[PDB]
Amino acid sequence: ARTLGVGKAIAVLTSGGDAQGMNAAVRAVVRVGIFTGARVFFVHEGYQGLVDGGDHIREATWESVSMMLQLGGTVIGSARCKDFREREGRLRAAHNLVKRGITNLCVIGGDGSLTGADTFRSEWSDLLSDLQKAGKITAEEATRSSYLNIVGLVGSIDNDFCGTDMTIGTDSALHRITEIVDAITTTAQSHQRTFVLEVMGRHCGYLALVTSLSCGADWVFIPECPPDDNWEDHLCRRLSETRTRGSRLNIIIVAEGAIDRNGKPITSEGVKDLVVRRLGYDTRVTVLGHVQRGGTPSAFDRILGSRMGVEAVMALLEGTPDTPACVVSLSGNQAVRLPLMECVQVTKDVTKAMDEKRFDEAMKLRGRSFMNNWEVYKLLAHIRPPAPKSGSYTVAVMNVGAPAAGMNAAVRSTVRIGLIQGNRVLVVHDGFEGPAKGQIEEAGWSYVGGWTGQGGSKLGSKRTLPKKSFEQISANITKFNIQGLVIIGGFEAYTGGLELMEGRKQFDELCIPFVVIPATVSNNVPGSDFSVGADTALNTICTTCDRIKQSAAGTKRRVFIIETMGGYCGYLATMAGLAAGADAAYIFEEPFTIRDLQANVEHLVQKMKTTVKRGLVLRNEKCNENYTTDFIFNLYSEEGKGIFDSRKNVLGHMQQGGSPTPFDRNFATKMGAKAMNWMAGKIKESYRNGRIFANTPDSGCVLGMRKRALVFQPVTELQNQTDFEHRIPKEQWWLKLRPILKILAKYE
Numbered sequence: 001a002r003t004l005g006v007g008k009a010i011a012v013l014t015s016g017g018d019a020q021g022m023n024a025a026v027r028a029v030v031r032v033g034i035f036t037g038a039r040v041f042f043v044h045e046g047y048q049g050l051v052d053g054g055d056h057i058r059e060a061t062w063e064s065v066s067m068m069l070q071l072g073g074t075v076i077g078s079a080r081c082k083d084f085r086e087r088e089g090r091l092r093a094a095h096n097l098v099k100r101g102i103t104n105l106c107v108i109g110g111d112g113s114l115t116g117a118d119t120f121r122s123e124w125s126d127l128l129s130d131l132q133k134a135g136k137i138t139a140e141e142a143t144r145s146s147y148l149n150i151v152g153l154v155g156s157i158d159n160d161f162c163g164t165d166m167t168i169g170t171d172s173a174l175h176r177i178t179e180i181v182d183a184i185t186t187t188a189q190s191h192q193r194t195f196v197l198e199v200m201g202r203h204c205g206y207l208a209l210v211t212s213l214s215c216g217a218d219w220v221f222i223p224e225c226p227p228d229d230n231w232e233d234h235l236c237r238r239l240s241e242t243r244t245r246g247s248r249l250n251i252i253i254v255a256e257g258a259i260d261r262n263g264k265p266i267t268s269e270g271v272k273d274l275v276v277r278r279l280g281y282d283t284r285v286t287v288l289g290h291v292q293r294g295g296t297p298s299a300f301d302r303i304l305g306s307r308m309g310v311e312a313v314m315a316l317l318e319g320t321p322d323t324p325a326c327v328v329s330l331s332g333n334q335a336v337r338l339p340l341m342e343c344v345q346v347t348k349d350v351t352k353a354m355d356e357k358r359f360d361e362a363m364k365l366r367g368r369s370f371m372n373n374w375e376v377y378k379l380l381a382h383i384r385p386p387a388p389k390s391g392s393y394t395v396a397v398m399n400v401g402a403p404a405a406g407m408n409a410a411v412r413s414t415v416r417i418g419l420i421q422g423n424r425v426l427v428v429h430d431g432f433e434g435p436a437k438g439q440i441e442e443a444g445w446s447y448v449g450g451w452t453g454q455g456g457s458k459l460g461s462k463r464t465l466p467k468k469s470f471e472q473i474s475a476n477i478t479k480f481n482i483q484g485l486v487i488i489g490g491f492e493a494y495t496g497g498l499e500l501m502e503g504r505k506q507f508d509e510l511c512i513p514f515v516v517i518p519a520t521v522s523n524n525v526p527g528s529d530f531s532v533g534a535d536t537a538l539n540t541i542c543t544t545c546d547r548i549k550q551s552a553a554g555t556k557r558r559v560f561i562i563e564t565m566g567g568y569c570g571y572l573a574t575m576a577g578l579a580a581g582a583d584a585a586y587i588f589e590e591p592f593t594i595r596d597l598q599a600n601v602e603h604l605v606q607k608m609k610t611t612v613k614r615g616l617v618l619r620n621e622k623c624n625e626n627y628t629t630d631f632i633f634n635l636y637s638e639e640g641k642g643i644f645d646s647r648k649n650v651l652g653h654m655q656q657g658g659s660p661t662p663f664d665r666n667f668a669t670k671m672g673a674k675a676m677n678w679m680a681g682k683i684k685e686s687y688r689n690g691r692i693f694a695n696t697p698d699s700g701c702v703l704g705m706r707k708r709a710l711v712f713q714p715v716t717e718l719q720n721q722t723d724f725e726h727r728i729p730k731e732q733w734w735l736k737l738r739p740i741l742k743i744l745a746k747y748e
């Protein structure tokens with residue numbers, strides 16, 4: 001309760017380099033801290049200000065952190081303080097903390113900033129014994145002894161720190177690198193242009209690799225897996241092969257830290273020389289640099305910051321004199337608290353691992369998804385397909401339902417990995433209306449050329465179901481020889497999937513296996529924590545929310561009521577509501593009585609009266625049939641008659657050809673591969689009599705992200721896990737957030 005951090009005060013601090021999201025993190029720490037009834041002190045300019053003092057440590061006020069969520073970089077400012085690397089420095093800062101009573105330290109930094117704080121709470125003890133030779137009164141110390149616990153949120157655009165699935169800013173970083181390539185690409189038309197982007201990457205190929213998977217990079221260079229002997233030619237033959245195969249351009253991403261087998265760095269510029277001294281085409285080089293670090297923070301990063309924030313402050317109060325250092329982290333999509341040292345003493349271990357030419361090892365400590373992205377990437381950018389024909393299983397891929405950003409990313413993968421396996425792959429136009437009307441065709445390796453970035457649905461999707469036309473489809477699945485189905489779509493994908501099983505009872509043809517890759521703006525599919533194209537939507541809501549809000553700022557003291565999409569699923573609403581820091585986001589999964597609405601409006605008002613000048617009120621397009629937008633609006637209006645102005649617009653259904661964000665492109669890529677892979681199997685094990693017959697419920701699935709790993713779940717199994725009238729899954733991880741969303745809004 002709010003009786004947790006009373007008689008307790010904490011110092012927050014950025015350190016290291018600006019990472020879009022640090023502000024949101026700070027804000028969280030400030031507010032949740034003040035909320036725990038504790039006191040929060042700012043401490044400007046990284047570890048410096050802590051070393052310095054007085055003027056560098058103002059006390060934080062609630063209002064102090066508004067207008068931050070969306071602001072790039074750090075407002076509490078960061079520095080590089082070399083002073084802190086030595087004891088004297090600490091003696092100095094530690095002095096400054098005990099002088100103000102602060103006993104809790106929040107450090108939002110990185111591999112370094114972290115290990116600094118790390119090796120501080122460490123030898124803090126004697127630091128006190130030392131401060132007693134004169135320093136301060138042993139009385140202001142007696143009761144401020146062994147309780148200086150510290151936690152550390154990892155900000156970092158290179159996302160290298162070991163232990164967390166995402167560091168703050170890297171999504172944003174990814175966005176930047178993408179926007180460029182996005183452009184660098186949509187207009188290179190004019191000669192076989194060959195770009196050479198050099199992205200951030202000390203001793204970490206993450207942004208490097210990922211940017212390559214989204215762009216459809218022709219070649220990459222990553223620290224952890226050096227090209228070893230040969231290659232120039234490899235890359236030439238490559239860039240050369242693709243030349244004849246037809247191509248407007250080439251993109252060769254290069255991690256900064258790009259080295260060769262021997263450690264003697266491969267230079268972006270050198271790559272350029274090569275590609276020209278050999279095949280010679282206008283080959284240019286760009287070196288993004290310190291921009292990747294700016295721009296405004298993405299929904300994810302705004303959100304990740306808020307989450308880590310609270311996790312930090314909590315870890316800070318629940319702290320103890322018998323507990324080790326905390327490093328809140330995202331993991332399996334749930335916040336964890338990992339031991340600081342363990343983390344650092346490891347994240348470090350990956351560099352050594354690399355120092356010694358032990359890259360297989362380096363690649364190991366990175367392990368996770370990394371290794372996959374790697375293998376999957378090489379595969380998809382791959383030279384080309386081997387010897388086809390023969391008794392190759394043939395699969396069909398289709399889209400079903402409302403369109404999404406990522407569908408093309410998914411289809412492209414599904415097909416390619418398909419051909420890499422040696423299987424035939426048909427492509428279906430217009431979801432189920434497809435096998436039915438029979439608009440099916442074979443997809444060659446190019447059919448999906450550079451789709452990865454294209455939004456909307458190249459293939460065509462319709463949310464119509466299949467039952468009413470099994471005759472037709474079964475007829476076609478028999479004529480085209482479809483013997484496996486990969487369905488990319490949303491609730492109708494799942495729903496039409498269940499509709500398939502039933503068919504297995506009446507039709508032999510239907511007795512093939514099928515996977516369902518979730519692609520829905522709304523994130524309403526049972527089976528996964530995230531569908532594809534959700535971020536892309538969620539990232540557009542956020543944007544225009546910020547616009548609407550931070551606009552017409554002339555009228556001053558005004559409130560906006562915004563209605564987001566998502567049917568009955570209040571994911572978008574809830575998430576955006578938290579990313580654009582709205583005072584309230586009325587969603588369906590959490591019913592509200594008018595006694596609430598009031599308590600809620602008799603609340604924004606008390607704010608529009610004092611501190612705040614702009615109000616944000618988000619409402620799910622279905623949170624409730626009577627308390628309509630128009631209801632909420634007028635209620636919010638009248639009630640704020642004197643005090644403020646207020647307008648209300650309905651975003652409605654947009655993102656027509658909305659280009660998928662780096663994350664959706666990746667998510668949609670990792671999957672369509674993971675499925676065409678899994679399907680290779682089921683078609684294998686479902687063959688028995690020179691016929692293929694799946695009639696188990698192991699075939700026919702929905703592939704979803706489940707707190708930590710993808711899992712093929714059987715449709716029939718999810719049924720009692722899903723509300724069908726509202727078309728929303730029954731368990732929704734994110735409802736767990738609402739509270740933290742109401743906290744940052746200063747409620748309860």
Ligand SMILES: Nc1ncnc2c1ncn2[C@@H]1O[C@H](COP(=O)(O)OP(=O)(O)O)[C@@H](O)[C@H]1O
Pocket residue numbers: 015016017046047048079080081082083084085086109110111112113114115116117119
């Ligand atoms: N080993 C260390 N001991 C003490 N402070 C450190 C250490 N490493 C880094 N720092 C501090 O972290 C801040 C920035 O270091 P950097 O190496 O840039 O960390 P990061 O990679 O997390 O941004 C500076 O205040 C620096 O003094």
Ligand SMILES: Nc1ncnc2c1ncn2[C@@H]1O[C@H](COP(=O)(O)OP(=O)(O)O)[C@@H](O)[C@H]1O
Pocket residue numbers: 165166171300332333368369370373530535663666667
């Ligand atoms: N845009 C995002 N929206 C939601 N979660 C995200 C986003 N970006 C990263 N994450 C989180 O980071 C986790 C770990 O990512 P990871 O396994 O390394 O794959 P990638 O290499 O695609 O990040 C994702 O599974 C997800 O939980």
Ligand SMILES: Nc1ncnc2c1ncn2[C@@H]1O[C@H](COP(=O)(O)OP(=O)(O)O)[C@@H](O)[C@H]1O
Pocket residue numbers: 217218219220221227234377378381382
């Ligand atoms: N797109 C790419 N970017 C960077 N390296 C690549 C790419 N594609 C292939 N390679 C590298 O080519 C080398 C050989 O490719 P591989 O698939 O192992 O077949 P083979 O070893 O017979 O040439 C590997 O080191 C692989 O990492």
